[PDB]
RNA sequence: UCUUGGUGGUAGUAGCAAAUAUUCAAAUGAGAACUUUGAAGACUGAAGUGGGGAAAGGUUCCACGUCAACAGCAGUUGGACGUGGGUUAGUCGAUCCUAAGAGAUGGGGAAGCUCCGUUUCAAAGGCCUGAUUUUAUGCAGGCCACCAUCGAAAGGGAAUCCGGUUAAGAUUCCGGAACCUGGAUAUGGAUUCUUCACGGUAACGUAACUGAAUGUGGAGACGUCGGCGCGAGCCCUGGGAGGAGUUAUCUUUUCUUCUUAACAGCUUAUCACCCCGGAAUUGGUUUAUCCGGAGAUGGGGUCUUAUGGCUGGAAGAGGCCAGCACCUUUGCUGGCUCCGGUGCGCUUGUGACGGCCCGUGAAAAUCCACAGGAAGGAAUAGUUUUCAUGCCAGGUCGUACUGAUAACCGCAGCAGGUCUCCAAGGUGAACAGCCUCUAGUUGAUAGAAUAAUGUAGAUAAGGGAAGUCGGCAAAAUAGAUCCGUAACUUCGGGAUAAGGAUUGGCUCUAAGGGUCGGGUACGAUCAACUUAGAACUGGUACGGACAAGGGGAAUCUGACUGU
RNA sequence: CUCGUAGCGGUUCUGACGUGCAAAUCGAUCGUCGAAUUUGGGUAUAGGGGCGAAAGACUAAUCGAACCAUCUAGUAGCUG
């Protein structure tokens, strides 16, 4: 809202650092079943509700 | 099967007094040794307008007897009181318009206003615009005085109760017609949310005991007992006689 | 000229509100908008200042009054009655 | 940015120990017939203010530029 | 070029006015100019001295 | 004509958000935020503007000196030199009345 | 019409048709209706498809790489995908204040979750000592009667502007120039043997010019409408100094640059006030009729500084050019940047007024002043300095971007909805419609063809409501000037009633202003668009597009505006 | 008060659309347009309650009684 609380920007900061794909070396690990980030979020596809 | 508008007013949510712009509580000066054995001299400094009140307010300034400071009391202005006028409150005071004296120490037929119902409750009788109180009697042993109230009733008050000489200013106000719903709108804008009024016969039966039917008609007698409750007291409450006054 | 025969100040209300009610307001709008003669300075400079309030434009002195006229007939009687009762008390 | 209209307060100002620099400006105020002269401004860097002394007479502009202290740093243009 | 034609008095006929006479030029502004002219003249004639202060007060209320 | 913008995050035409379009040394027009206009100090008796005193916003009066805030009389920046003169007359004429009302009262009770 | 999942026919069907519109060439590329550049055509047309913001979003901003999925065609493009970069504040907000309100405590209720109440029936408490050597300043006087706290990113409020800078930040960075608050503190000045200033008749003036408790006053602090005055910015325009366009012909021409911030000093005012004077033959005076023996007119003054002018800031910056260098580090040098006019213009701010109300149109923090005289203090400057200068510090959080025919909500890249600022020329009464400038966009699956039936827009001979439940839809009327205008009426209206004429272009005519002046029978000068009239002229056209009332006679019904 | 923009509503075409652009839009034609106006933010009133210039209207596409969970696999002489 361009004049945020810090508590809003801190959760906004967290969401950007989570906004990445899976690291590719994790898919090479032993007994690994993770194929992709199932918790990926977009600003266009899902609003994160404060 | 729904609570009616006359019941909903007691919850006091949207039905309160619109009291932002009002100048204060229009009371008398607190009854003390100055006003019980001699007098005290005030001074009008403003005749101001009170929001939602049809009567002007006189700001009368006194000196505090015990501390060096000025105490500003707010009076209802009497018709004839001006700015710059010395105002006397007490027992030994002189009868002029705007002076405050006990009811016992003013003669029969004196015209008073802002009259205490009990000695020292700072003004209860004759406070609307134009109204006044006439002293019609005295019982000096067991000090009381007989008055005529603005309704025409007869009341017996202590002779230590106070009053201000004169009528309350602003009289003749209701004699002017409002002419339109707009001037009713701004009168009640600064009082409280009682306006407008929907007729109960113009309703549905769930909302009012008068509503419903294929024609707008009351159905039962509009006169209801005093011994009824909320939801049934929608009409003429405890009426003695109805209709015009033609005998 | 003489623009209206009878409505006068009440021509702002048009044809509305009834002719009785326009006549009823007319005598009080003339009464509330007139300049009145001051009792202190003597000049005709008293106008209404939110009903019951009558400030004189010169001498800056405000008189509590009636709603539409400076003194009501009812409070004229009070000035006669209280003056009589003041003399017969201090007689 | 105060404007100084006097020589003796200007010299008293240039030894104030908060002033360390100054700038001198040459303006070429060529008008039609009144005065097409060579204006010279003496701006003084005080701590809270910049003091300008304008000298339109080009004689006194040569006189004041000599009498400045040597602990002050002068900027031409 | 149209502005010069307007100055010379063209394109101002009855077929070129869409507004009323008051919308095009308010009668109050006509009065304000014309009263201020007569009051300028009256003060100029009194103060220079070609009318006295008595003929002035007659014409001022007639203006 | 070049058009301007509010230079603060308030986009509303409130009392605290008034602008004056001004031209810069960069040749462009820009909004300039105008402070509130000050009110003259009114008289403590008649409530008229009292002269010789600066017209500043109420916290600016702590910055200026005492000369801007007071006239050289009694009741200087309080009252308005006609209310003061009336105050001196009204002071004087009452103790001379009180002295007269004392010797009138004392003499008339000394008789009977 | 079971449940969950999967799959068909319909079917390569319906459809992908609102928002005027695209086209040529080159470049890139595997591939171009869609990308990029150039050219062209167009549109939004300043109440914008333009520049910013509030809520909301949250990285969408910007760069590089990329095109599997997504952009209902395509795609080399992207608000997509991958990797990164990006948000700088003493001065802008939050923070502080109170509003409507919310809400602890004391206390009462309720089995209890908890409810009431916000000053109450409470033993509800901090503030400075005049000023320091028995002071961690109290182990002392002395003062104060209220009583949490939350509540506004539109209300109140200490103080920052210009220029430049980025791929993306900016009233935050950089450069220059200020200011405020808090603290400490020296010097100069001021005042002082009259110990706490002097001048003026006064209004009041000044660089200063002690002031405790306490009290009082002011500011913060206020409606709306109207007209008038003044200012800023814009618009219009003259002369000149450049640059660009057109140039068969005409055009001393058309477009364009010619700027000055916060802050500071000096001046600058309607209103208000002071002195002299004493007014009827009443005078002054506003657009608007108020004022004057409670002292007008008049002659002298005083004050507020809205606001304007000068100067500093500041021409050194910004703009427009020119010349020469011409992977020149990358520029270097030089010139100009000047003087006006106009106004029922537009937007805005303000001032003095007037109108309106049974409506008279917040509060507090905060800051100052006065009254009072507590205390302390005089040598060649004792104190005190709200005078000038000098020193130090200014925390935390926010800041990017969109703000919507793609960044918000509506399942979504939905013709919907969602608060606000700025606002160019012409036509015209106009912020209307229509066209253009600045800026912006040219996005919406396309191509070909021109069947029916549609949808949207038209026109129609003669008739003119015969249609239909019903003139539904459409047509007709329409601006302005002048004429004329009924019944009825609550006397205000009806009413633009009804009706009827005129309207273009050109060339003229006539009114209607401002500044300049007298002797101890006078016209230079400039400027504005209204109105009236005339002639001439024409395929009798002329409110030439646009814009824009159909009207009348009756009855019912609700008085009316409003919901 | 009136004509009429912006605005705010929603008369008529019973127009378009009616597997829409849209679970209420689009277009024309309209009402009204300086106040009983329109509107943002803050705040208050809460389900048998509120609120209602009154239509059983509105109270998150839900209203002659909101929504959520539980009692609850409520009961069914009725249909599959
Ligand atoms: Mg936080
Ligand atoms: Mg009713
Ligand atoms: Mg009903
Ligand atoms: Mg006009
Ligand atoms: Mg007129
Ligand atoms: Mg604010
Ligand atoms: Mg299935
Ligand atoms: Mg299928
Ligand atoms: Mg097909
Ligand atoms: Mg097709
Ligand atoms: Mg168009
Ligand atoms: Mg166009
Ligand atoms: Mg890219
Ligand atoms: Mg596709
Ligand atoms: Mg593809
Ligand atoms: Mg982008
Ligand atoms: Mg990315
Ligand atoms: Mg601030
Ligand atoms: Mg607090
Ligand atoms: Mg707070
Ligand atoms: Mg306010
Ligand atoms: Mg800048
Ligand atoms: Mg930016
Ligand atoms: Mg800086
Ligand atoms: Mg000294
Ligand atoms: Mg001195
Ligand atoms: Mg003050
Ligand atoms: Mg600044
Ligand atoms: Mg005079
Ligand atoms: Mg505006
Ligand atoms: Mg100082
Ligand atoms: Mg930023
Ligand atoms: Mg920004
Ligand atoms: Mg932005
Ligand atoms: Mg949702
Ligand atoms: Mg799409
Ligand atoms: Mg225009
Ligand atoms: Mg015009
Ligand atoms: Mg299209
Ligand atoms: Mg036909
Ligand atoms: Mg025909
Ligand atoms: Mg028929
Ligand atoms: Mg038939
Ligand atoms: Mg029709
Ligand atoms: Mg006409
Ligand atoms: Mg007609
Ligand atoms: Mg008729
Ligand atoms: Mg009706
Ligand atoms: Mg009815
Ligand atoms: Mg009736
Ligand atoms: Mg109606
Ligand atoms: Mg109307
Ligand atoms: Mg109307
Ligand atoms: Mg409209
Ligand atoms: Mg409908
Ligand atoms: Mg339909
Ligand atoms: Mg679809
Ligand atoms: Mg209207
Ligand atoms: Mg809006
Ligand atoms: Mg109930
Ligand atoms: Mg019903
Ligand atoms: Mg439910
Ligand atoms: Mg069941």
From Swiss-Prot, chain B:
GO BP terms, alphabetized: cytoplasmic translation; maintenance of translational fidelity; ribosomal large subunit biogenesis
Subcellular location: Cytoplasm
Pfam families (alphabetical): Ribosomal_L2 (PF00181), Ribosomal_L2_C (PF03947)
Modified residues (Phosphoserine): 51, 94, 158-159
GO cellular component, one term: cytosolic large ribosomal subunit
Gene3D superfamilies registered for this protein in UniProt: 2.30.30.30, Nucleic acid-binding proteins (2.40.50.140), Ribosomal protein L2, domain 3 (4.10.950.10)
Main localization (coarse): cytoplasm
Classification via SUPFAM superfamilies: Nucleic acid-binding proteins, Translation proteins SH3-like domain
InterPro entries: NA-bd_OB-fold (IPR012340), Rib_uL2_dom2 (IPR014722), Ribosomal_uL2 (IPR002171), Ribosomal_uL2_C (IPR022669), Ribosomal_uL2_CS (IPR022671), Ribosomal_uL2_dom3 (IPR014726), Ribosomal_uL2_RNA-bd_dom (IPR022666), Translation_prot_SH3-like_sf (IPR008991)
Claim: Ion transport is one of the keywords in the record: no
Annotated keywords: Cytoplasm, Isopeptide bond, Phosphoprotein, Ribonucleoprotein, Ribosomal protein, RNA-binding, rRNA-binding, Ubl conjugation
Family, similarity comment: Belongs to the universal ribosomal protein uL2 family.
Protein name from the UniProt record: Large ribosomal subunit protein uL2A
Species: Saccharomyces cerevisiae (strain ATCC 204508 / S288c) (Baker's yeast)
Gene for this chain: RPL2A
From Swiss-Prot, chain D:
Subcellular location: Cytoplasm
GO biological process, one term: protein-RNA complex assembly
Parts forming coiled coils: none
InterPro entries attached to this UniProt entry: Ribosomal_eL38 (IPR002675), Ribosomal_eL38_sf (IPR038464)
Taxonomic superkingdom: Eukaryota
GO CC term, one of those recorded: cytosolic large ribosomal subunit
Predominant subcellular localization, coarse grouping: cytoplasm
UniProt keywords, alphabetically: Cytoplasm, Ribonucleoprotein, Ribosomal protein
Disulfide links within the chain: none
GO MF entries: structural constituent of ribosome
Segment forming the signal sequence: none
Note: Present with 50200 molecules/cell in log phase SD medium.
Oligomer and partners: Component of the large ribosomal subunit (LSU). Mature yeast ribosomes consist of a small (40S) and a large (60S) subunit. The 40S small subunit contains 1 molecule of ribosomal RNA (18S rRNA) and 33 different proteins (encoded by 57 genes). The large 60S subunit contains 3 rRNA molecules (25S, 5.8S and 5S rRNA) and 46 different proteins (encoded by 81 genes).
Functional description taken from the UniProt entry: Component of the ribosome, a large ribonucleoprotein complex responsible for the synthesis of proteins in the cell. The small ribosomal subunit (SSU) binds messenger RNAs (mRNAs) and translates the encoded message by selecting cognate aminoacyl-transfer RNA (tRNA) molecules. The large subunit (LSU) contains the ribosomal catalytic site termed the peptidyl transferase center (PTC), which catalyzes the formation of peptide bonds, thereby polymerizing the amino acids delivered by tRNAs into a polypeptide chain.
Family statement drawn from the similarity comment of this UniProt entry: Belongs to the eukaryotic ribosomal protein eL38 family.
From Swiss-Prot, chain E:
Single GO term (MF): RNA binding
Subcellular location: Cytoplasm
Modification Phosphoserine, positions: 27
CC per GO annotation: cytosol; cytosolic large ribosomal subunit
Main location (coarse class): cytoplasm
Chain spans, region Disordered: 1-21
Parts forming coiled coils: none
GO biological process terms, semicolon-separated: cytoplasmic translation
UniProt keyword list: Cytoplasm, Isopeptide bond, Phosphoprotein, Ribonucleoprotein, Ribosomal protein, Ubl conjugation
Entry annotated with the keyword Calcium: no
Miscellaneous comment as given in the Swiss-Prot or TrEMBL entry: Present with 97700 molecules/cell in log phase SD medium. There are 2 genes for eL19 in yeast.
Binding partners and assembly: Component of the large ribosomal subunit (LSU). Mature yeast ribosomes consist of a small (40S) and a large (60S) subunit. The 40S small subunit contains 1 molecule of ribosomal RNA (18S rRNA) and 33 different proteins (encoded by 57 genes). The large 60S subunit contains 3 rRNA molecules (25S, 5.8S and 5S rRNA) and 46 different proteins (encoded by 81 genes). eL19 lies in close proximity to the binding site for eukaryotic initiation factor eIF4G.
UniProt family annotation: Belongs to the eukaryotic ribosomal protein eL19 family.
Protein name as catalogued: Large ribosomal subunit protein eL19A
Species annotation: Saccharomyces cerevisiae (strain ATCC 204508 / S288c)
Gene: RPL19A
UniProtKB/Swiss-Prot annotation, chain F:
Protein name: Large ribosomal subunit protein eL34A
Record's subunit section: Component of the large ribosomal subunit (LSU). Mature yeast ribosomes consist of a small (40S) and a large (60S) subunit. The 40S small subunit contains 1 molecule of ribosomal RNA (18S rRNA) and 33 different proteins (encoded by 57 genes). The large 60S subunit contains 3 rRNA molecules (25S, 5.8S and 5S rRNA) and 46 different proteins (encoded by 81 genes).
Single Gene Ontology BP annotation: cytoplasmic translation
Coiled-coil spans in chain: none
Chief localisation class: cytoplasm
Entry similarity comment: Belongs to the eukaryotic ribosomal protein eL34 family.
CC per GO annotation: cytosol; cytosolic large ribosomal subunit; preribosome, large subunit precursor
Compartments where located: Cytoplasm
InterPro entries reported for this sequence: Ribosomal_eL34, Ribosomal_eL34_C_sf, Ribosomal_eL34_CS
Functional note: Component of the ribosome, a large ribonucleoprotein complex responsible for the synthesis of proteins in the cell. The small ribosomal subunit (SSU) binds messenger RNAs (mRNAs) and translates the encoded message by selecting cognate aminoacyl-transfer RNA (tRNA) molecules. The large subunit (LSU) contains the ribosomal catalytic site termed the peptidyl transferase center (PTC), which catalyzes the formation of peptide bonds, thereby polymerizing the amino acids delivered by tRNAs into a polypeptide chain.
One MF annotation (Gene Ontology) recorded for this entry: structural constituent of ribosome
Species of origin: Saccharomyces cerevisiae (strain ATCC 204508 / S288c)
Top-level division of the source organism's lineage: Eukaryota
This protein's record includes keyword NAD: no
């Amino acid at each position: 809202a361009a004049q945020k609380s810090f508590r809003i920007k801190q959760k906004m900061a967290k969401a950007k650092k989570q906004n990445r794909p899976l690291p590719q070396w994790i898919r090479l690990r032993t007994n690994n079943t993770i194929r992709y980030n199932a918790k990926r979020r977009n600003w266009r596809r899902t609003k994160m509700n404060i | 099967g729904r609570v009616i508008r006359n019941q909903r007013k007691g919850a006091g949510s949207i039905f309160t007094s619109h009291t932002r712009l009002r100048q204060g509580a229009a009371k008398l000066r607190t009854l003390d040794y100055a006003e019980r054995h001699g007098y005290i001299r005030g001074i009008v400094k403003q005749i101001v307008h009170d929001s939602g009140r049809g009567a002007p307010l006189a700001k009368v300034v006194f000196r505090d007897p015990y501390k060096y400071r000025l105490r500003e009391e707010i009076f209802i202005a009497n018709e004839g009181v001006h700015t710059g006028q010395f105002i006397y409150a007490g027992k030994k005071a002189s009868l002029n318009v705007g002076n405050v004296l006990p009811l016992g120490s003013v003669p029969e037929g004196t015209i008073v206003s802002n009259v205490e119902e009990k000695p020292g409750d700072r003004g209860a009788l004759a406070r609307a615009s134009g109204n006044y109180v006439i002293i019609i009697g005295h019982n000096p042993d067991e000090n009381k005085t007989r008055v005529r109230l603005p309704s025409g009733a007869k009341k017996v008050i202590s002779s230590d109760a106070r009053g201000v000489i004169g009528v309350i200013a602003g009289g003749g106000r209701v004699d002017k017609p409002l002419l339109k719903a707009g001037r009713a709108f701004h009168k009640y804008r600064l009082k409280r949310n009682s306006w407008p009024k929907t007729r109960g016969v113009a309703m549905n039966p769930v909302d009012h005991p008068h509503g419903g039917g294929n024609h707008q008609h009351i159905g039962k007698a509009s006169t209801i007992s005093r011994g009824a409750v909320s939801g049934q007291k929608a009409g003429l409450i405890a009426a003695r006689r109805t209709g015009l006054l033609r005998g | 000229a003489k623009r209206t025969k009878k409505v006068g100040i009440t021509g702002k209300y048009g044809v509305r509100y009834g002719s009785s009610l326009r006549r009823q307001v007319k005598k009080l709008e003339i009464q509330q908008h007139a300049r009145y003669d001051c009792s202190f300075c003597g000049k005709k400079t008293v106008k209404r200042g939110a009903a019951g309030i009558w400030t004189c434009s010169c001498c800056k002195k405000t008189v509590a009054g009636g709603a539409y006229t400076v003194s009501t007939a009812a409070a004229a009687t009070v000035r006669s009655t209280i003056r009589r009762l003041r003399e017969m008390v201090e007689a | 940015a105060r404007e100084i209209t006097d020589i003796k307060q200007f010299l008293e100002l240039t030894r104030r120990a908060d002033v360390k620099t100054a700038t001198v400006k040459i303006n070429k105020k060529l008008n039609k017939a009144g005065k097409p002269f060579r204006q010279t401004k003496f701006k003084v860097r005080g701590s809270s203010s910049l003091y300008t002394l304008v000298i339109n007479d080009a004689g006194k502009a040569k006189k004041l530029i000599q009498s400045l202290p040597p602990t002050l740093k002068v900027n031409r243009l | 070029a149209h502005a010069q034609s307007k100055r010379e008095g063209r394109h101002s006929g009855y077929g070129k006015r869409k507004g009323t006479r008051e919308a095009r030029l308010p009668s109050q502004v006509v009065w304000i100019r014309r009263l201020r002219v007569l009051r300028r003249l009256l003060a100029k004639y009194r103060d220079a001295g070609k009318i006295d202060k008595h003929l002035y007060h007659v014409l001022y209320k007639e203006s | 004509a070049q058009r301007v913008t509010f230079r603060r995050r308030n986009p509303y035409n409130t009392r605290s958000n008034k602008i004056k379009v001004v031209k810069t040394p960069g040749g462009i027009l820009r909004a300039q935020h105008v402070k509130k206009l000050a009110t003259r100090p009114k008289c403590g008796d008649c409530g008229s503007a009292l002269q010789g005193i600066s017209t500043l916003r109420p916290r600016q009066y702590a910055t200026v000196s005492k000369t801007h805030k007071t006239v050289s009389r009694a009741y200087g920046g309080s009252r308005c030199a006609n209310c003061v003169k009336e105050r001196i007359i009204r002071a004087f004429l009452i103790e001379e009345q009180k002295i007269v009302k004392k010797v009138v009262k004392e003499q008339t009770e000394a008789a009977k």
